[PDB]
Amino acid sequence: KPNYALKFTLAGHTKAVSSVKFSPNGEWLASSSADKLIKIWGAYDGKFEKTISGHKLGISDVAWSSDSNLLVSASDDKTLKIWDVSSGKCLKTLKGHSNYVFCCNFNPQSNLIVSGSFDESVRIWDVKTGKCLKTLPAHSDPVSAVHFNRDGSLIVSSSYDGLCRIWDTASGQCLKTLIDDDNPPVSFVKFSPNGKYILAATLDNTLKLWDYSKGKCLKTYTGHKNEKYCIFANFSVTGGKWIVSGSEDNLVYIWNLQTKEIVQKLQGHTDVVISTACHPTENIIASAALENDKTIKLWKSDC
């Protein structure tokens, strides 16, 4: 079992945090907030680095390019922005969604961005030109998450319509729809590091690990509370193989991926834990709580 202990508590955002992400190179944590700001923090010391401003309304998600040089953000102002993190420059503003942009990610090459929106579509954008390449009529409710697979040939999307869908990046065809005899809103999805599986959160207090190739649920993780908020889940891969998630009871939950047992609950936040992220090389978790709490915490484990 891991032994995560609180190391640093960070604060600075003035409204609800929506997402935290560690840079792939391990140096930084990025956070996004309803305060319209992206903030960069030192991954190892929690030291505030800088604000990156420019969005006109709140931000729902931020994501790093695979070389850690760029960030993309998704905002209620109906744009995505691509940022050069080192300089803070806005490289491109991506206009095309007809309503709030809720989620975003680069492909592993980091030449494409995928976005999902309240407009119920998924869009695929060229990073260098900032132009939209494809629009997919993906869902019948807002799109909560979008993620490329290991080689970038597939995109997984999720929606409050209860569907997880897998799209062919090149053709835009809807290849698969995952259904578990029910339809609770899906608030998050992502491919596993090896690309074989899809991890999905639904607003019935459940995380599910799906076999992509088979279209079948392999494992479920339960014990936490998640009926309202868009709470990501993480694969922790630096030490023991865990699933990590925030929870609406103010705790971070950590499960054994294989056995599905809870192995730790992290106590310290005083409001919903809206987001978590796992450091790429060290056994470090970042957690962020909602607006009654307003802190981001860095926790470290020996394994």
Curated annotation (Swiss-Prot):
Gene3D superfamilies: YVTN repeat-like/Quinoprotein amine dehydrogenase (2.130.10.10)
Modified residues annotated as N6-acetyllysine in this record: 81
Site, as annotated: Important for interaction with histone H3: 76, 102, 232, 291
Annotated GO biological process: gluconeogenesis; negative regulation of transcription by RNA polymerase II; positive regulation of DNA-templated transcription; positive regulation of gluconeogenesis; regulation of cell cycle; regulation of cell division; regulation of DNA-templated transcription; regulation of embryonic development
Result, substituting residue 76 to A: Strongly reduced affinity for histone H3. Significant decrease in interaction with KMT2A
InterPro entries named in the record: G-protein_beta_WD-40_rep, WD40/YVTN_repeat-like_dom_sf, WD40_repeat_CS, WD40_repeat_dom_sf, WD40_rpt
GO MF entry, a single one: histone H3K4 methyltransferase activity
GO cellular component, one term: MLL1/2 complex
Protein's cellular compartments: Nucleus
Principal cellular location given in the protein's record: nucleus
Keywords on record: Acetylation, Chromatin regulator, Host-virus interaction, Isopeptide bond, Nucleus, Repeat, Transcription, Transcription regulation, Ubl conjugation, WD repeat
Glycyl lysine isopeptide (Lys-Gly) (interchain with G-Cter in SUMO2) crosslink location in chain: 15
Source taxon at top rank: Eukaryota
WD repeat residues: 12-51, 54-95, 97-137, 138-177, 181-222, 225-265, 268-302
Pfam families, per the entry: Beta-prop_WDR5
Subunit structure: Interacts with PAXBP1; the interaction is direct and links a WDR5-containing histone methyltransferase complex to PAX7 and PAX3. Interacts with HCFC1. Component of the ATAC complex, a complex with histone acetyltransferase activity on histones H3 and H4. Component of the SET1 complex, at least composed of the catalytic subunit (SETD1A or SETD1B), WDR5, WDR82, RBBP5, ASH2L/ASH2, CXXC1/CFP1, HCFC1 and DPY30. Core component of several methyltransferase-containing complexes including MLL1/MLL, MLL2/3 (also named ASCOM complex) and MLL4/WBP7.
Function: Contributes to histone modification. May position the N-terminus of histone H3 for efficient trimethylation at 'Lys-4'. As part of the MLL1/MLL complex it is involved in methylation and dimethylation at 'Lys-4' of histone H3. H3 'Lys-4' methylation represents a specific tag for epigenetic transcriptional activation. As part of the NSL complex it may be involved in acetylation of nucleosomal histone H4 on several lysine residues. May regulate osteoblasts differentiation.
Family: Belongs to the WD repeat WDR5/wds family.
Protein name: WD repeat-containing protein 5
Protein source organism: Homo sapiens
